[PDB]
Amino acid sequence: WQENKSWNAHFTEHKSQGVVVLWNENKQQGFTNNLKRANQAFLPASTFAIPNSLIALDLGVVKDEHQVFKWDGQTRDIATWNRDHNLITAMKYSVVPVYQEFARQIGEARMSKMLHAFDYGNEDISGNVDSFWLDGGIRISATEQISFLRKLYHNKLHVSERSQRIVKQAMLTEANGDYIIRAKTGYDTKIGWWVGWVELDDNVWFFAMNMDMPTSDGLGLRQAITKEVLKQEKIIP
């Protein structure tokens, strides 16, 4: 692990504070602007969609990425949530009601065992079984996110290969002739997350970033700052 404090400019240029963590898979080397904050554990918020979806698929709670989760008919504040969804759109729009239903069907006992088998963060599900990743005791650091994501990328998590492939499909965020990004955003009113990886022809760069997010206005800085770092390191054009 190498600390590049010159990456701090990418945060300070946006009047922001946070951490970007990168992992070169071929070289087995990591880079970050702040080693300490790279290892600071936060609530996963909507980034918990990745383990949650994996467990739900492996237990049969979700059949596949096409299966429709009917809206319960409760109107909530996020407009995108009040409609039918599948695994793809649930991940795209961070539809909490869907993932809460996942967690309830999974149950406390299976959820706890699965997160331990996943070596996921602090592995603590204290709180409501359907809201612990939002207001409970589970915490995960950026380096721990990358550890988890590396296992997912290689199909080495303790779930079926099929479940991992489907979740990685649902993680699809951006793709062009130069790279593929599979990733998941998160925002809990205090900090914003972006965790995932960049697939290249001959390598994969894993990333996990978080930053202080006082207001929603700057949510796009999550991706912008990350991509500005990736471009500086010549990972993407």
Ligand X SMILES: *C(=O)[C@@H]([C@@H]1NC(C(=O)O)=C(S[C@@H]2CN[C@H](C(=O)N(C)C)C2)[C@@H]1C)[C@@H](C)O
* Residue 40 binds to Cl ion (criterion: CB under 5 A): no
Which part of the chain contacts ligand X (CB under 6 A), choosing from 102-110, 121-129, 179-187, 229-237?
Answer: 179-187
* Residue 169 binds to Cl ion (criterion: CB under 5 A): yes
CA atoms 97, 187, 165, 125: torsion sign:
negative
Could you give phi then psi for residue 103, rounded to 5 degrees? -65, -45
160 is catalytic: no
Cβ 195 to Cl ion, closest distance in Å? Answer: 13
- Kindly write out the interface string for residues 12-41 of this chain, putting x where it contacts Zn ion by CB under 5 A and - elsewhere: -x----------------------------
Q: Nearer to a copy of itself by C-beta: 37 or 184?
A: 184
Query: Both tokens of residue 195?
Result: 């965790």
- Spot the catalytic one: 6, 16, 46, 112: 46
Q: At how many degrees (to 10) do helices 49-58 and 96-117 cross?
A: 80
Residues sharing a CB contact under 8 Å with residue 108, sequence separation 6 or more, in sequence order: 125, 129
Query: Both tokens of residue 68?
Result: 């429709």
DSSP 8-state symbol, 218: G
Closest Cα partner for 197 from 172, 165, 232, 178? 172
CA angle 95, 101, 107 (to 5 degrees): 135
* Residue 16 binds to ligand X (criterion: CB under 6 A): no
Which part of the chain contacts Zn ion (CB under 5 A), choosing from 59-67, 74-82, 184-192, 227-235?
Answer: 227-235
| Residues at the contact surface with Cl ion, assessed by CB under 5 A | 46, 96, 99, 169
Footprint of ligand X (CB under 6 A): 45-46, 93-94, 96, 134, 185-188, 219
Annotated binding-site members for Mg(2+): 82
